[model samples]
Target: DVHGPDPTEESITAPRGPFEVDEESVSRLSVSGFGGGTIYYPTDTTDGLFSAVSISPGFTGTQETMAWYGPRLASQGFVVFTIDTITTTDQPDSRARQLQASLDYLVNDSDVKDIIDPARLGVMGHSMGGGGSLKAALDNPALKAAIPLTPWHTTKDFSGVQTPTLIIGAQNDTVAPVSQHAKPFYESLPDDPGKAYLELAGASHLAPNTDNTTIAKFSIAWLKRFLDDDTRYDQFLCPPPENDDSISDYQSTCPYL
Candidate 1:
């Protein structure tokens, strides 16, 4: 069953999926280890607790820069938390700690305990924050999944990362070149843990920060397949894509294996 049919271009661009996101709720919390952060969740109740993801912004970037993904993921049935750091210029390792703290807040904070599923936790970010997400996964190996969009880090020692990872790279990203950042990180990951690399065609360093539907689509698919254990999203990852115009290149290990 892991070797399912390949995904076509049409399936990749669908405006919506099985989950209907009509409304969502948002809240702001002053986390102990970090600054303040915003959390989002669907207003509708599901049979089980909602999966969660903690997101961070890049160097010198604020929570607003990454806040857009909160609703995007929340509407699709995830409890999303976009965090701000004590210092905007903090490094990847520092940001990693803050990201983990966000997850800790979701677990320890009594207000939203019933709504979140702590066991199905994930992390994501852009640029430096993306690198931080990797570091976060390395520091906390229990993370269900990790997605780093055009990540940038000083070192290539991601050998400690065991969480299932998806490294999103931009073809034209000059800030954090694919050759230097994304590819090396993906390669360093142990194959048994499962890893993937998705390269967007004609994209720049700011691609993930903007309203890119392709990134939104695949991000949801990756999170659903791994965090939610939903097999319906498998087609989007395995067998990859053949000749899609929007995607320059893609590689993924089927989680079902």
Candidate 2:
């Protein structure tokens, strides 16, 4: 029951190998996998770069919805990923195929291997897609970290998560109530240094990423902290500001606190 139309089998390919675009910088080839999701490489990305797995929004969203953030992220030095789920339901198998395919492309290719540091990669999803991303991280090792935005919860348990995870849910999501969507899954994560949850007040299911501007700021910030292990952007993920016009009532239950 994918709610709406799934994506058609369309191919999206990019130039392969290390590319010299800007005179002062270098760029690597970006590609895509099954389900038509795109992969990105950092600018001047000659070696040791992080990868991303973007889970597209449910039925109605276009790939461009996420692509809006790519150029900005590229400027900030992160190659971004954006998948097309226009046709398939955001279920486990479909998402698993997409994630694994991206990993295959990054880890199996010699040129890509030189540029990607498999040890530092992230998978992210929004709405129903968010739930898919979280489940994939808990079930697979390819994902070093994950950011699930306003996900929907089912009967499955996420107690086996072995990597760092960040769950951001919107309190105002009328479609999938925050308590029903994020609480149970958040509690299921293993007790560790990197698992956390933030409940936004006025935020809706799409608030986490409705446009490129917000996605660039929010996604990059979170990825920098978890994938890059940099704390400069941590505050945006944990204890995110309570934008009176956006969302609020955020909280996280961790051992350190």
Candidate 3:
């Protein structure tokens, strides 16, 4: 066993991935929902391993979206993982179960033992899937940290969260309001010291995957800091939101980061 949680939970099916790169890298396996799978990127060097839990997308999206960061993160000497949660989008209980199962798999999988720290791990997701990731952390006290991007709801209280949390909300997004996803989580952290909130202006729910500016950069830094306590890059973890009070030319109101 890799050294963590138990993996005797229910199994679900791995769903089809929509993106080319993700489909190429991931291997499907039955787990706990209609769509469940795990993506693995082997490490060529043995510096360290960092695993992640990803909640699948909603009806429209596919596991392919997750492909963007896995290889890149893996190249940085971290093991990245993604899971397809049933239909995605706000399925809290289902998402929580899938996340737990995936974490269990990470802890118990024989192959994962050498590369992963078992102690260093993180969870992240986008859009509705982002919401799922947030719920997963709140539900499972074992997770070390969680990052939710452009989450759908902010009011969900995570006062019980033991893991340090990073909420990356997009001020330009409407599909999943930043307030609905980031604000509530940020405010309700129950005075946790590791809480952080960042709302990027002009960034949408796809902020982490879009344009390749510095969004991806910040995510990598934040996750690393949370998992390893590598404060060397802590500055980038969760910066303040940009122009949260201003109305967009697009006449949209995003949540204050």
Candidate 4:
């Protein structure tokens, strides 16, 4: 379904989409597996049910650290959840469950459930939270899309991932270097039409923690392609964006299915 206003290179790449967005707070008491966080969604119901994604913050971080994604993506015709872990030190595996729980809450328990299409959902995160999102997608293949930004994890092999995923890496990341973390993780993923790896030239692990346009643009494109099932946004993804000083490297099994 072409869910939103037809995407333009200008709209998808901009700081926000055409939809008006509203935010609501979810307290920890309302969810079990993860600490409750915030939910961002398009205020209009004319589009029918909207797809969604739940994001987790990394170790020693809170939902506020990744809050920028809430409005930016929700305004793009998708629901976005930025969740906090039960504890800051929670590992990738646990973070995975928290991601699931947050989506579960939004779908089954939130006041805004009526506006969400439970069938169309996705996951994303930063740093360890990024690693957690991969595991989250692995555990639940029904997820429409997954994005691991500057991800970090001890596990190297993700050969079983089924959902379309985009792994974004930072060039000079000291915490989760591309060679050891992002690169190998991308290599391990099956070379299917849905997989891709993007390296931000001369950037660092904390880059995603800020409002980086590069991360926001690609992530939105992937979600639009897979979750919304809208290929109108494919131009930015297909043909494989050229690598420049800003994008040190890029790889994908393109012409997405």
Candidate 5:
């Protein structure tokens, strides 16, 4: 009865999940810290409060660039916010704070606040915004989970990030090569069973800007695994997902129980 209905790899990996998702725009005129974006939320009130996630785009990108995540994640049962930075060129640290502000807006002021569980929140981003996700989690250890997609940060070391994180990298990302960014960041994380590193085989830095199954499936599992504290997702994370056409490498200390 807890969490969602039964989950299988095929079911979770599908384009959309069980819940019916709805979207609301957060106008720039009404926001304080981050540029206003969109909020995607599940329409199920019977389940009580749901966890929430805030997502940001990389440099020169806007909220619309991160739009795919809104419906995709919310349908799987969480409140999702795809936000724009105060300025398009804001750095990772600034983007991190913007994400925090977005979440605060969700829980404290959004019209949908009644449906969210404040403590069970998460953050995500692409490229430097992905770097923002890392910093957000590092500063706010209380966050339940984080997913940094092909994150690009000048600083490589993130030894103190305690929140469970799933870091994704693109195998052919010349823009933010795995060797230069993902690997070192993964290595620096303090040992934790809930952490994971997934390298998308032959993909480019901008692959996540579009809808990709590998990104969606694994991300859903990571979010559910951590934010929900629902172990049903453990099946996908453990066994570590063998490398194949879609994935080049996968690493994690599993049995995240």
Candidate 6:
């Protein structure tokens, strides 16, 4: 019943973040034989270097649907890439490969190669792509963090994922119900990887894809805390606020937060 806020109505009009949004300099990047995506990075690199994140869209989803995160996260000081798979309807495993390919392109073939900090990397997605985010983390254990938004998956076995993970769920998402997808995936994580789950009170399966302010707020915090090793975001991660009106459920094993 909690459908949450309408993304189109709550759309981000300007730099609602800590850094100024550089939409003017943002570029389109494509690598031959590689998936296509849009890149958003800070216009000012005086802060030294920025971390990078590769995002994958859901089954049959295009870059247009997943583009919301790129600018928002980039404005907050990260190199963000939102990609389109070789085939729109590809399965999660296939999407995982595409996500990896995009990351490889970004780090090796793309223009931001030198500006991106290899050590600071993250992955995120929606629906099937959300599940693919987990697969990508399993394939690349060195990933600094992983965030799966309202993920949908068939297999329940996720014993090998060691990257720190944050699973975001929607209370009213029938397309990929929280009980069947997000919760099980979170429970499947091994004790060592460390994890957290945030179930929005009235969100939908597409909530994460939209420009939801709450999703953007915590996502930046999660990436900052794990990918950048920035302890300043600890308060947002641990001893989490009680009965946060926006969040219906919350859990965390991050001791530092």
Mind giving the per-residue lDDT tens digits that candidate 2 earns over 1-257?
00111211110011122232211111123445545555555556443455544445543554555554444444444556566652555564455456555556556653446656666767776766677677678668656677777777464478877767777777778876777877777888876656767666666767755552333455555566566666645545556545634335545543222
Q: What is the lDDT of candidate 1?
A: 0.80
> Quick one: RMSD of model 2?
10.3
Cα-based lDDT for every prediction: 0.80, 0.57, 0.55, 0.90, 0.89, 0.78
Q: Mind sharing the TM-score for model 4?
A: 0.97
Report how far residue 181 has shifted in candidate 6, in Å.
1.0
Q: Report the Cα lDDT for candidate 5.
A: 0.89
- Residue 140 CA displacement from its true place in model 3, Å: 2.0
Compared to the true structure, candidate 3 yields what TM-score?
0.73
- Positional deviation of residue 72's Cα in model 4 after best superposition, in angstroms: 0.6
* Alpha-carbon TM-score of each model against the true structure: 0.89, 0.72, 0.73, 0.97, 0.97, 0.88
Q: Please, what are the lDDT tens digits per residue for candidate 3 over residues 196-222?
A: 666676766676654343445555555
What is the per-residue lDDT of model 4 for residues 54-137, given as tens digits with 9 covering 90 to 100?
999998999988999999999888889999999999999899988998888888999889998899999999999999999998
C-alpha RMSD between model 1 and the true structure:
3.6
Query: What stretches of model 4 exceed 4 Å from their correct place?
Result: none
Model 2, TM vs. native: 0.72
Query: What are the C-alpha RMSDs, in order, of all predicted structures?
Result: 3.6, 10.3, 9.9, 1.1, 1.2, 6.2
Residue 94 accuracy (lDDT) in model 1 = 88
Backbone steric clashes in candidate 1, count: 0
Please give the distance, in angstroms, between residue 243's alpha carbon in candidate 5 and its true position after superposition: 4.9
Candidate 2 deviant stretches above 4 angstroms:
1-33, 46-48, 90-93, 109-113, 212-218, 234-245, 253-257
Model 1 residue 3 lDDT score: 15
Worst 10 residues of 5 by lDDT: 1-10
Off by over 4 Å in 5: none
Q: Return whichever of 2 and 4 wins on TM-score.
A: 4
Considering lDDT, which of the candidate structures 4 and 6 is the better prediction for this target?
4
Clashes of each: 0, 13, 12, 0, 0, 2
The sequence of per-residue lDDT tens digits that candidate 6 reaches over residues 1-257 is 10112222133233344455453222334364336878877776566678888888998888889888877888767888888777788888887777888788878887788878887788999999999999999999989889998998886677789888989999899999988999999988876646888999988788876787778877877887788777666666777647668899987776653
Q: What is the lDDT of candidate 4?
A: 0.90
